[PDB]
Amino acid sequence: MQIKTKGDLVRAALRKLGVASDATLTDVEPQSMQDAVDDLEAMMAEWYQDGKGIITGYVFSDDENPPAEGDDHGLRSSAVSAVFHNLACRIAPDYALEATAKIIATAKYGKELLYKQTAISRAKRAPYPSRMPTGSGNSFANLNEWHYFPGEQ
């Protein structure tokens, strides 16, 4: 996918903002890269909300290995186009720039597609209430003296 590392995400965001890329004559100083990757880590930890929020393949740096910019991320190929777009939208306040409306629309689309699958998977129907008889048509649960449903428990 050529965007394997977190630094690739940061560089893609910077290129999308137009601040710096491979074909540019001025570049960004590494401390700004460190700040941007820290901001990316903070943003990605607010979408996860500890397993209760947007769930995507992502591994957080354990801080034992010094450079968190170099290590891999577990993002699937589909979520990359959303993560770095949102990162670029968040970075622009750091500089004097403002994100173009196209980037905002792309970030919206990316987050919606990120959460749609989990929304489908999490729409489950609750069991029958505690005080609900099972009718005389089951003929087996009725003969096993288990007339009423167990409950949500």
> Residue 129: exposed, middle, or buried by beta-carbon count in 10 A (0-12, 13-18, 19+)?
exposed
Residue 78 is a binding residue for a second copy (CB under 8 A): yes
113 binds, among a second copy, other proteins, none (CB under 5 to 8 A by kind): a second copy
What are the beta bridge partners of residue 5? 72
Length, in residues, of the chain: 153
> Residue 115: exposed, middle, or buried by beta-carbon count in 10 A (0-12, 13-18, 19+)?
middle
143 binds, among a second copy, other proteins, none (CB under 5 to 8 A by kind): other proteins
Residues numbered 80 to 139 that lie near a second copy (CB under 8 A) are 80-82, 89-90, 92-96, 98-100, 102-103, 106, 110, 113, 117
Residue 148 is a binding residue for a second copy (CB under 8 A): no
Residue 43 is a binding residue for a second copy (CB under 8 A): yes
